[PDB]
Design a protein around this ligand. Structure first.
Ligand code: NEA
Length: 393
DNA sequence: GTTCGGTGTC
DNA sequence: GACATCGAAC
């Protein structure tokens, strides 16, 4: 893993430390952030680097190198500045997840970190650990994925940061070559409060920050790139979550173990549908992408709503809204399934057209950009629907 | 019950 | 770039 020079230079320009102050790089390896800070600001600081792998630790004689797990590390004194590129990844089984430690080690992480939620992430834990090691008024500058701005797993982290000091977020995007990650820079100071959102422009000279919006009373709410247009559209109709009960499909293991499900086609058997069967405005009932077949009438045994024709919205097609009416009522292995609430009048074909419209695609791309490769529930439930498509009596 | 990807594979 | 994970995780 190597952070591009223009990304490092941009983060160092945001970094601050008092003279003689303690500067720390977690997961430092050879320590590119300590070197860049020293070149820019001088030698009159106490430079420290923390690294877990003895093969990776290679710091110059002017920096103190510590062989330790940063997440379970207990230093004597706190730090004035913390900067760097933390490792990213979910801790779990090797067949599914990239971070592999003993169960007892993961238990030590869960115990240490109050923001740990769901599967969580290594970079979330690094963020909380760094804030806890900061002096009052201390500065943190990290480069992390943009996923923590919107996702539920990071709700406690967002609430934590809003409570501990003031936050600036700088959107970079996919700035790491051969790494599938949309990145942001977080500047945190352990004093004051509020959130500042920034866009960036890339030139040959580096990255230039452009102020987008300020949220002085930010309490840990989902972070979005709002405009005059997005606000206008949102108050034009009811939120989609107010009109529909939104459920997700049964998961692959539920189908695989179910006695009615077959691994091969046959008489009376029908394909279990995935996201590859869902298109803007229609459903492909013929193609099988899951490798699973079952009787259509037996679908209600996994989820009761599989027996009722309903609205299906896509989950893994990037940040966009792809919808279709499932007229036939098939078994689904993926996607959102929207069941109208009591007293809700709807026009299925008109609502599908609105959800697939270019106005809606632009709406979600403005707010959520490419933070995640999904349309999430929290994005979906906030989508505006006017009386022409769905009415609540 | 549903969430998430230094994505996974074409 | 297309076109989406899919199952271990809680
Ligand atoms: N800063 C570069 C990307 S993060 C990758 C580096 O962080 C180190 N690393 C991974 N987990 C760590 C941990 N828990 N504590 C300290 N260093 C870690 C790895 O050895 C690797 O050199």
């Amino acid at each position: 893993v190597e952070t591009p020079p223009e990304v490092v230079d941009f983060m160092v320009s945001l970094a601050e430390a008092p003279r003689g102050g303690r500067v720390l790089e977690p997961a430092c390896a050879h320590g590119p952030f300590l070197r860049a800070f020293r070149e820019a600001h001088g030698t009159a600081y106490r430079f420290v680097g923390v690294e877990i792998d003895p093969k990776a630790l290679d710091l110059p004689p002017w920096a103190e190198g510590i062989l330790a797990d940063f997440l379970l590390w207990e230093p004597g004194e706190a730090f004035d500045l913390i900067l760097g590129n933390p490792p990213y990844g979910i801790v779990g089984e090797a067949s599914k997840y990239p971070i592999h430690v003993f169960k007892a080690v993961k238990d030590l992480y869960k115990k240490a970190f109050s923001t740990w939620k769901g599967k969580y992430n290594l970079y979330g834990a690094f963020l909380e650990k760094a804030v806890r090691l900061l002096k009052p008024g201390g500065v943190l500058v990290f480069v992390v994925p943009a996923t923590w701005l919107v996702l539920e797993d990071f709700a406690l982290l967002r609430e934590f940061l809003a409570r501990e000091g003031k936050t600036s977020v700088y959107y970079l995007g996919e700035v790491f070559p051969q790494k599938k990650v949309s990145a942001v820079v977080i500047r945190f100071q352990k004093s004051g409060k509020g959130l500042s959102l920034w866009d960036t422009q890339e030139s040959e000279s580096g990255f230039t920050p452009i102020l987008w919006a300020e949220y002085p009373h930010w309490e840990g709410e989902i972070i979005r790139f709002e405009t005059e247009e997005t606000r206008k559209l949102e108050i034009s109709g009811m939120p989609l979550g107010d009109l529909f009960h939104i459920r997700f499909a049964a998961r692959s293991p539920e189908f695989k173990k179910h006695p009615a499900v077959r691994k091969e086609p046959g008489p009376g058997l029908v394909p279990v549908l995935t996201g590859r069967n869902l298109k803007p405005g229609w459903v492909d009932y013929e193609k099988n992408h899951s490798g699973l077949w079952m009787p259509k009438e037996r679908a209600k045994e996994l989820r009761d709503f599989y027996a009722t024709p309903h609205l299906v919205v896509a989950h893994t097609k990037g940040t966009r809204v792809v919808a279709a009416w499932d007229e036939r009522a098939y078994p689904w292995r993926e996607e959102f399934h929207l069941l109208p609430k009591e007293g809700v009048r709807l026009d299925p074909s008109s609502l599908v057209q609105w959800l697939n419209s270019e106005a809606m695609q632009k709406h979600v791309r403005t707010l959520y950009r490419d933070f995640v490769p999904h349309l999430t529930l929290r994005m979906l439930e906030r989508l505006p629907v006017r009386r022409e498509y769905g009415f609540h009596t």
